[PDB]
Amino acid sequence: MDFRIGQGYDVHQLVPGRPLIIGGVTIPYERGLLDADVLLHAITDALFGAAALGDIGRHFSDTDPRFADSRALLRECASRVAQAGFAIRNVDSTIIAQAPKLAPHIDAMRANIAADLDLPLDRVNVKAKTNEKLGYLGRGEGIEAQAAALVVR
Amino acid sequence: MDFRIGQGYDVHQLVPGRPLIIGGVTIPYERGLLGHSDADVLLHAITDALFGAAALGDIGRHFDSRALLRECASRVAQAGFAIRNVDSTIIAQAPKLAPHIDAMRANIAADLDLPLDRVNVKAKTNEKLGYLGRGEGIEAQAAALVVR
Amino acid sequence: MDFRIGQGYDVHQLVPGRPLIIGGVTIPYERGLLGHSDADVLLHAITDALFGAAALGDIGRHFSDTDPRFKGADSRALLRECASRVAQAGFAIRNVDSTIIAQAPKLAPHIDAMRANIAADLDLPLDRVNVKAKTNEKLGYLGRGEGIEAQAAALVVR
Ligand SMILES: Nc1ccn([C@@H]2O[C@H](CO)[C@@H](O)[C@H]2O)c(=O)n1
Ligand SMILES: Nc1ccn([C@@H]2O[C@H](CO)[C@@H](O)[C@H]2O)c(=O)n1
Ligand SMILES: Nc1ccn([C@@H]2O[C@H](CO)[C@@H](O)[C@H]2O)c(=O)n1
Ligand SMILES: [Cl-]
Numbered sequence: 394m395d396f397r398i399g400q401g402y403d404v405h406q407l408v409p410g411r412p413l414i415i416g417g418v419t420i421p422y423e424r425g426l427l428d429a430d431v432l433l434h435a436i437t438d439a440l441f442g443a444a445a446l447g448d449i450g451r452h453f454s455d456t457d458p459r460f461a462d463s464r465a466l467l468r469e470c471a472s473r474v475a476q477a478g479f480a481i482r483n484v485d486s487t488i489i490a491q492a493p494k495l496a497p498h499i500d501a502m503r504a505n506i507a508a509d510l511d512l513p514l515d516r517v518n519v520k521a522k523t524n525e526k527l528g529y530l531g532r533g534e535g536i537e538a539q540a541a542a543l544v545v546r
Numbered sequence: 547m548d549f550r551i552g553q554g555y556d557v558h559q560l561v562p563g564r565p566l567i568i569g570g571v572t573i574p575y576e577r578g579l580l581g582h583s584d585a586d587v588l589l590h591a592i593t594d595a596l597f598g599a600a601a602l603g604d605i606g607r608h609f610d611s612r613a614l615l616r617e618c619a620s621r622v623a624q625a626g627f628a629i630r631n632v633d634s635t636i637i638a639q640a641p642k643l644a645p646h647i648d649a650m651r652a653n654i655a656a657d658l659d660l661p662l663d664r665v666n667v668k669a670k671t672n673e674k675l676g677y678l679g680r681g682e683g684i685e686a687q688a689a690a691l692v693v694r
Numbered sequence: 695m696d697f698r699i700g701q702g703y704d705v706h707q708l709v710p711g712r713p714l715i716i717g718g719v720t721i722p723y724e725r726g727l728l729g730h731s732d733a734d735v736l737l738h739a740i741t742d743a744l745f746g747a748a749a750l751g752d753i754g755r756h757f758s759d760t761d762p763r764f765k766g767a768d769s770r771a772l773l774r775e776c777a778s779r780v781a782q783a784g785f786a787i788r789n790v791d792s793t794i795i796a797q798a799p800k801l802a803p804h805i806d807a808m809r810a811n812i813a814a815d816l817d818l819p820l821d822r823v824n825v826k827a828k829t830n831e832k833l834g835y836l837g838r839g840e841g842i843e844a845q846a847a848a849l850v851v852r
């Protein structure tokens with residue numbers, strides 16, 4: 394068959410004054426991302442990438458009247474991928490954040506993502522890493538997400 | 547069928563008195579990428595991902611950047627692989643890459659003898675974080691699928 | 695034809711008084727990687743990619759970052775257990791690719807040995823495993839030699 398891979402990347406600053414929302418989940422924390430859902434953006438990009446449809450910013454413009462939260466954008470991304478003729482086979486991802494502890498929220502993120510993509514739960518994975526106190530990530534000045542997606546025509 | 551994946555990463559410093567060439571496109575800008583070659587960060591990343599998918603080592607083991615990308619494709623074919631698709635991301639705070647991306651994709655598809663629909667190029671800023679966010683460098687990431 | 699992909703990321707600080715172990719190879723160096731285990735950044739990145747492809751969470755879920763039993767743990771034994779759990783989930787590994795980002799030391803003389811280790815631990819031929827290396831072009835904490843990063847991608851099939 395006609396398999397394709399895509400990859401995705403995103404990053405946002407972490408400062409006091411905003412909520413922390415990752416993978417559709419609000420996480421109690423003294424800082425927040427400037428909805429800024431890094432995980433969902435990275436996955437969205439990975440999906441557009443696999444389908445060879447450009448990137449998230451080309452589809453969902455900052456100014457566009459029609460566009461909403463990152464979960465809504467993920468659902469629209471999936472519909473556009475479906476229409477291009479592709480079925481999603483799996484998603485894997487990594488969140489790099491020095492803090493807070495993300496492990497408790499992983500299943501919720503996975504359920505949110507699988508729901509939005511209409512995928513069996515066992516085809517969505519989310520992982521978490523600190524940056525070992527290195528760089529802006531290790532200083533808690535930002536949070537990064539990475540994603541990989543496999544699709545088939 | 548015998549599918550393989552590869553991943554590629556590259557970064558280059560932005561310095562004065564150099565042309566900015568990304569995905570074969572010369573972009574007007576006060577700085578350009580520093581490297582031994584023409585320092586095309588996107589093409590190097592894709593090259594590494596293709597060598598990676600074919601398990602042929604890396605770009606430094608083997609070697610303008612389009613010529614090298616063409617040579618990469620040759621050696622991937624030499625090894626018995628056909629390229630199925632390529633995806634990538636450019637991380638640049640500045641300049642605006644939007645008007646240049648379609649050409650980048652066209653360039654890459656030409657060099658890899660692939661139709662446009664099997665090649666993708668994406669772009670992000672680094673939200674003003676780190677060396678990328680200060681406009682000190684530009685990073686590229688790539689994923690490639692091949693089959694034997 | 696039930697293919698899945700996974701991706702992995704790891705980084706560790708490079709400090710004095712530690713062995714430098716990357717891809718299971720002990721590299722002569724005045725510094726080594728800091729972690730709870732042997733801190734093998736490449737193997738941890740690959741382990742993460744495999745667990746990820748099989749949708750089994752991540753390396754910390756399986757091999758606790760704070761469990762004393764993993765103090766100085768051999769990250770190859772961890773990779774072998776990962777592959778065993780991936781097989782138990784019903785997946786065969788098809789290939790692995792990876793990158794190490796390091797200012798120093800020179801990794802080229804050790805790369806083939808790293809590849810052989812990973813191939814052995816994953817029960818794969820050499821031609822299905824790849825290890826790439828590069829500098830960070832003097833940029834950032836990696837350019838200052840404060841740590842070493844690895845990236846990995848894996849393809850499996852159920
Ligand atoms: N240096 C850059 C960085 C990003 N972009 C484009 O901006 C949108 C938002 O990421 C995306 O659509 C992306 O392609 C750009 O044109 N130049
Ligand atoms: N710390 C490092 C970084 C890079 N390299 C090798 O140099 C070539 C160009 O990056 C590549 O072939 C790469 O393998 C190395 O041996 N050690
Ligand atoms: N910000 C973070 C960083 C890491 N983790 C979890 O810690 C374990 C070791 O990396 C891993 O199991 C990882 O999931 C976390 O829960 N939150
Ligand atoms: Cl460096």
Ligand SMILES: [Mg+2]
């Ligand atoms: Mg990075």
Ligand SMILES: [Zn+2]
Binds near residue numbers: 434
């Ligand atoms: Zn974002």
Ligand SMILES: [Zn+2]
Binds near residue numbers: 556557558585590
């Ligand atoms: Zn380069």
Ligand SMILES: [Zn+2]
Binds near residue numbers: 706734
């Ligand atoms: Zn590690």
